[PDB]
Amino acid sequence: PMSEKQLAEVVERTVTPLMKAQAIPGMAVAVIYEGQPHYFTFGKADVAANKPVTPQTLFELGSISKTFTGVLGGDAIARGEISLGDPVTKYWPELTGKQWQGIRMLDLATYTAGGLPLQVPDEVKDNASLLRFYQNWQPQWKPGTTRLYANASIGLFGALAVKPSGMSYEQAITTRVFKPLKLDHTWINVPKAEEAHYAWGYRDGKAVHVSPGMLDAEAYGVKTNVQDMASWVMVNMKPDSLQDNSLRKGLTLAQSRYWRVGAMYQGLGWEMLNWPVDAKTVVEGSDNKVALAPLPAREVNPPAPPVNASWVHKTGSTGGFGSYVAFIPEKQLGIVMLANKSYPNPARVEAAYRILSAL
Structure with a gap:
């Protein structure tokens, strides 16, 4: 849909019926078309106060935080600080149990x-x-x-x-990933000074934020807006636009293929499937019955490097938020859908597929 108004129609005609069927109060959406971001915002960030979701609204990424973790782990590997090959036990000597x-x-x-x-x-x-x-x-x-x-x-x-860097997880991610990439409105802990932009999530009609938890920052704790999320996507879509440093190598490692499970490949945080992809395969693969189930995994020897013809995605939830990211580096096409209601994962994938297969 070359036109921005054609783009806006493709997004709205899918998003609006989605918000009504899933009772989602607000959603911020970013479509990267020909490598450029375009933002579409719907509904409310704060239902009591009647605040609209805009591109400055912070949403809880939930599990999409794992893509930051992955890339941070990839950046430590390019630095020679850690290797994937290593026994966990070299980073936690107190873990002496034999299962380890x-x-x-x-x-x-x-x-x-x-x-x-x-x-x-x-x-x-x-x-x-x-x-x-x-x-x-x-x-x-x-x-x-x-x-x-x-x-x-x-x-x-x-x-x-992050232990070999001598930095806390929050400091490592902030210094090695967020700042170098100019994601200045992406946090593990949202500053009190910026709280006003922080959407409330809605769980049973109740306004909630994620509760403190052990390994939260690492697994489901990043908060951003759609602007930084779009920048994150464009940078992962085209790493070669960077400076041949540790971070560039890091982004390449996170989209490398380490395992084949069914029709998907497991990267670091990121998951990929060969593009073009059947809508049935990707939507059904995201259902809890399949995505949360234990599945046999075939290790790729010498992890395969990134293939541009991939559907690269990650769904992320918290109790009050539901967000999704998918991109195809080959076509330089991407989408980010941040929502303040955790609705079924298959519906996120279905909606993004519908929007992307029309462009």
């Missing part, structure tokens, strides 16, 4: 350690109870064979990836 070896930083980054759970238990409030949690976890499968999507796996990869 054979388990590599790679298995943590890509949910392939043998069954770490979806969520860190809420009983776990500090470093000691977290240590005890991993010491007492019992694998259901051998390491490096089974993929089970997990905050407890990549959350730990993130916290461990």
Whole structure:
């Protein structure tokens, strides 16, 4: 749809019926068409105060934060600070239990350690109870064979990836990823001074924000607006637009293919499927029944480097937010849909597919 008004129609005709069917109060959308961002905003950021969602509105990324984690882990690898090959145990010597070896930083980054759970238990409030949690976890499968999507796996990869830098996770991500990329309105903790832009999420008609949790920043804690989210997409769509540094290499590593699961490839945070892609395959693959299930995983020897003809995406949720990102570097086409209501993942994928297959 060359025209911006044609673009706006393609977005609205899908988004509006989506908000009504899913009772979503607000949504901020970014379409990257020919490499340029275009913003479309709908509904409310704050339903009580009647605030509209604009491109300055901060949304909780939820699991999309994992794409930042991935790229931060890739940047530490290009720096020689950590290697995916390494035993987890070289970054956490207190993890002495026998189930732990054979388990590599790679298995943590890509949910392939043998069954770490979806969520860190809420009983776990500090470093000691977290240590005890991993010491007492019992694998259901051998390491490096089974993929089970997990905050407890990549959350730990993130916290461990950053220890060689001497920086806290918040400081590492902010200095090595957010700032260099000029994502100045992307945070782990939203400043009090910027709170006014922070949308409320809606769970059962209740306004909520994500609750503190162990490994939250690492697994589901980034907050941004659609402007920074669009910049994040354009930069991951075209890394070669960067300076051959550690971060450029990092972005390349995050979209490398480490495992093949069904019709998808597991990158660091990012997930990819060969483009063109059947709508049925991608929408159904995002259902909880498949995406949250344990699935056999075939390791790619020498991780395959990025293929431009991919559907690269990530769905991210918190209790009050539902967001989705998908891009095709080949066509330089992308979409970001940030919403303040966590609605089914298949509906996010379906909507983005519908908008993207029309451009």
